[PDB]
Each structure stands twice: as C-alpha cells, then as structure tokens.
Design a protein around this ligand. Structure first.
Ligand SMILES: *[C@@H]1O[C@H](CO)[C@@H](O)[C@H](O)[C@H]1NC(C)=O
Ligand SMILES: *[C@@H]1O[C@H](CO)[C@@H](O)[C@H](O)[C@H]1NC(C)=O
Ligand SMILES: *[C@@H]1O[C@H](CO)[C@@H](O)[C@H](O)[C@H]1NC(C)=O
Lengths: 50, 49, 49, 110
C-alpha cells in the first residue's frame, strides 16, 4: 500500500530517512579503516617514533 | 534525496576504502545515534572487512 | 515487589575510572556546553543514576 | 617469445568459477572476482566479456625472458616479475592482493 505524505501532516506521519550501517566481524583481511595521525617530524633529539 | 522504498530498500556494500567517521559525528543534521557496542572514539581505532 | 523506589540505582557513564576502593558520590552532568562528543545541553549528556 | 601473444591468466578453485580473471597487456586490469562465462578469446582486435558480482578492482601500468612467480599465502596473493638459460637474477615484488581466496587451478589466455 502506498504511503500518504503531505506537508500538512503531523510529525508522527512526517517522512523520515533511515540509513542502517552494519559491519561484519573480523574474519577476513581488513579493508575499511580511518585516518590515524599526521604528526610532524623532529630531528637530533631523543624521541619515541612509531 | 532519492531513496528506495522501505519494502525495496537498496543495499550498498562499502569496502576497500578509508572511512571518515568524524563528519557524521560532528553534524547536527542527524538525530538518532543508537549504536551498539561501538562508541565514536572506538570504531576509528580498528578496521573491519 | 514495591519497596524498591528510587533507592537502588547504579552508574552507567564514562569518565570516572576510579582506582580500587574509591567512592564516587557525585552527580556530574555535562549540562554546560561542549563540542567533540555532542554534550551541549541535551545530547550525549543524561542522568547516570 | 618475441611477440605479444600471451597477455593474461585465469585462476580458479573448483571449475574456474572463482576469482582472478587477469589481463596484463601493458595497463594491468582488475583482478576481478567474477565467476565465469568468458566466451570468445581468439585474438581480440575488442575487450571485456560477460560478468557477475565483481567484488574487487585494480588498475596499474639474445631475447627477453618474461618471467613471473605467483604465490598465495595467508590470504595474500603475490606476484614477482622480471623481463631479462644460465645466469642469476633476483625477482622484485609488484603487487599484494588482499583477496584471500583459494586457488587450485589456472589456465592461460594467449
Ligand atoms: C591502457 O589503459 C586504457 C584505459 O584507459 C585501456 O583501455 C587500455 O586497454 C590499456 N592498454 C592496454 C594495452 O591494455
Ligand atoms: C554474488 O555473490 C553473492 C554471495 O554468494 C550472491 O548472493 C549473489 O547472488 C551473487 N551475485 C550474482 C549477480 O550472482
Ligand atoms: C578455502 O578452503 C578452506 C577449506 O577448504 C575453507 O575453510 C576456506 O573458507 C576457503 N576460503 C574461502 C575464501 O572460501
């Protein structure tokens, strides 16, 4: 059955968009990540590097 | 703005790319944030398939 | 049954990472304004009791 | 062979319905994950073929001995290559595909 959507309808019947994102568990090589850091570089000083 | 109907929803597979989660989390245009287990800091510190 | 009423209640939120044997008798809520994890007046800030 | 007769390879696990349909003439095309139905391959002078639910892609750039080594270990597919029998010469890596699927059979396109 078709929805009835009008600008004068109530908030309960107002149209709303829902996006559901589901990520699978770790069972395969990873392909989706995020940016880590962009820290600057220093020289001639005792530092801990990663 | 063009989304499919609820009975005929469109499934999009996203992989083999870097995901940016800060843009979604720093926007007030969204109201629902019901996420289970994950927190906005956590999911940026690991990777999935 | 009926006896328990606003008397037995635990804490759910973050921040307090108390060391062993510490009593955190506080009602801290971010009803003041922030930006990273929402937390302005209503979002990502509730009553953890 | 001093020619361009051979260009790509086909890999598969059960009945060549698995991944790795390659075409590496100059511009190496995607290591696709489609299943089967390649159909015509005599001397294309055309591209492409029938496809399926592809789930990966990739695009990159005496006589000569075109030599390769193909490995699949720990969910990683690895290729080593050289262009130029006695003598000694090491092989340097080219790519590293995280596809991580089983391969047990392979054929050649030519
Ligand atoms: C070079 O790349 C183009 C993509 O624009 C492709 O069409 C062409 O087939 C490639 N060259 C060879 C020899 O395959
Ligand atoms: C691609 O693979 C999935 C998983 O096996 C399958 O459900 C789907 O039907 C396949 N797509 C096509 C077009 O066959
Ligand atoms: C490869 O085969 C093994 C055993 O035959 C199986 O456990 C594994 O899931 C297969 N790999 C893929 C990607 O299906």
């Amino acid at each position: 059955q078709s929805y009835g959507f009008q600008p004068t309808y109530g908030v309960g019947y107002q149209p709303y968009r829902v996006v559901v994102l589901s990520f699978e568990l770790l069972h395969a090589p990873a392909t989706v990540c995020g940016p880590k850091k962009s820290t600057n570089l220093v020289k001639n000083k005792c530092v801990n590097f990663n | 703005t063009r989304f499919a109907s609820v009975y005929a929803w469109n499934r999009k597979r996203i992989s083999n790319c870097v995901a940016d989660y800060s843009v979604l989390y720093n926007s007030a245009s969204f109201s629902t944030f019901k996420c289970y287990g994950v927190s906005p800091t956590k999911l940026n510190d690991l990777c999935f398939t | 049954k009926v006896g328990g009423n606003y008397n037995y209640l635990y804490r759910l939120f973050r921040k307090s990472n108390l060391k062993p044997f510490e009593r955190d008798i506080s009602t801290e809520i971010y009803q003041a304004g922030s930006t990273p994890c929402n937390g302005v007046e209503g979002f990502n800030c509730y009553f953890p009791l | 062979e001093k020619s361009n007769i051979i260009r790509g390879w086909i890999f598969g696990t059960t009945l060549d319905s698995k991944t790795q349909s390659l075409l590496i003439v100059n511009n190496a095309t995607n290591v696709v994950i489609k299943v089967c139905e390649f159909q015509f391959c005599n001397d294309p002078f055309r591209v492409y073929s029938s496809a399926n639910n592809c789930t990966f892609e990739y695009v990159s750039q005496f006589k000569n001995l075109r030599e390769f080594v193909f490995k699949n270990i720990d969910g990683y597919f690895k290729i080593y290559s050289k262009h130029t029998p006695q003598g000694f010469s090491a092989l340097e890596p080219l790519v590293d595909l995280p596809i991580g699927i089983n391969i047990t059979r392979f054929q050649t396109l030519l």
